[PDB]
Design a protein around this ligand. Structure first.
Ligand SMILES: O=c1[nH]cnc2scc(-c3ccccc3)c12
Lengths: 126, 126
């Protein structure tokens, strides 16, 4: 049946760098954007929600506006790639990619953030 | 928009009893079992996958084999009813019903399990 896959179920990224998290789903010939739903989430916070060709910004969590982007070029290749810029320790956790495209599936991804002591200390105080 | 709703987001159950957890979804005009996808989950363990007309269970977790079923005749009324028989302390946690029906939404449901000392002891010690 319709199956979402990830080339990587674990990412280890460096504090302050950018990460792109990949999420593949089958596309026959070309994408029908009006049939597509892409839901990126991270432990119960909505990061991105792409419904039938355009994103719903009313539900996006404030922490991810201005840092999260759905690479819509990769959408047509069947790759719902999430890009987070300026990765912080609070971005460590479990991510879920959910696609509805004539069928529905989801996959989990775990992000670990390596950080130097100064950055961990500031996060530690908050 | 396609909204999934729950009449209750919290269930309290007695150890060893049966629980039936409910998710409602909008059925516009006649139910098209072909376009319906239902996932029941609990702390990222898969309980049920209902993919276009039938139950997929080769992805169903151990902890719910022989105990979980989707109440299929409720589907016509827009009701994704998950029934767990022989409820155990480890059934406590946060559940998720995820529904794809020409729109996609999920809701969370917390379950608490009351239990007598002995049941709690065996589960605590394991
Ligand atoms: O459940 C959701 N909620 C919000 N968006 C989306 S896109 C795809 C899904 C989905 C639904 C059921 C099973 C597998 C995936 C989904």
């Amino acid at each position: 049946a319709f199956t979402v896959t990830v080339p990587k179920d674990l990412y280890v990224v460096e504090y302050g760098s950018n990460m792109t998290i990949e999420c593949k789903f089958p596309v026959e010939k070309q994408l029908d954007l009006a049939a597509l739903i892409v839901y990126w989430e991270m432990e119960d916070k909505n990061i991105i929600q792409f419904v039938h060709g355009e994103e719903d910004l009313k539900t996006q969590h404030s922490s991810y506006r201005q840092r999260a982007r759905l690479l819509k070029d990769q959408l047509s290749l069947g790759n719902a790639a999430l890009q987070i810029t300026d990765v912080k320790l609070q971005d460590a956790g479990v991510y879920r990619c959910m696609i509805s495209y004539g069928g529905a599936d989801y996959k989990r991804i775990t992000v670990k953030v390596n950080a130097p002591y100064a950055a961990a200390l500031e996060h530690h105080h908050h």
